[PDB]
């Protein structure tokens, strides 16, 4: 099976886009070919769970890319050896850590280095980060940086592709919960529509 790790923070852990992506995989005829991997397996009870849903993920509410890069990622990828890694991180670096864009892209680099050390053929999706309701400018600065980072980092052996979940790709405030940070059902549909097709293409590419 193709092993996929859905790495992230609360936007991965406590949201419902992962079931939608699994549905897409199912619809593509790939549910028997795909194993979602990771240390966590919680899903909120208000999400519409497809039957057969693979609940494993590597989402952690409140965790920062800074910390994950330095303390956790090597363990997680060493334990699971994913073929594909999809992530959105950085929201807590800003809102909790008060870190800048240079910090966050640096932490990206350290995470990707660890993913590749575990698997030099890993295929990676980096998500441009959803906006906060208040259009946090350091989040946008990370988003403006992601394409250059990808250009610097992507290789034929280990491609890095972008799932653009940003303001600029259509993420509206109407897609946020009342806390101004997490996607509501509309934002989950949007997220799943950006990630799911890139993830399906990568799955198909895995040898
Ligand atoms: C720094 C932000 C860290 C994560 C805060 C997560 C807040 C999640 O909030 C929770 O969402 C649930 C639905 O998903 C609701 O059922 C709960 O009542 C609510 O507390
Ligand atoms: O969860 S509903 O507000 O889009
Ligand atoms: Ca699994």
From TrEMBL:
Disulfide bond sites: 16-47
Record-listed Ca(2+) binding positions: 35-36, 54, 56
Annotated binding of Zn(2+), by residue: 56
Keyword Mitochondrion in annotation: no
GO CC field: extracellular region
GO BP annotations, alphabetical order: carbohydrate metabolic process
One function term, GO molecular function aspect: phosphatidylcholine lysophospholipase activity
Transmembrane segments: none
Keywords noted in UniProt: Calcium, Metal-binding, Signal, Zinc
Name of the protein described by the UniProt record: Acetic acid
Species this protein is from: Talaromyces pinophilus (Penicillium pinophilum)
Gene encoding the protein: axe
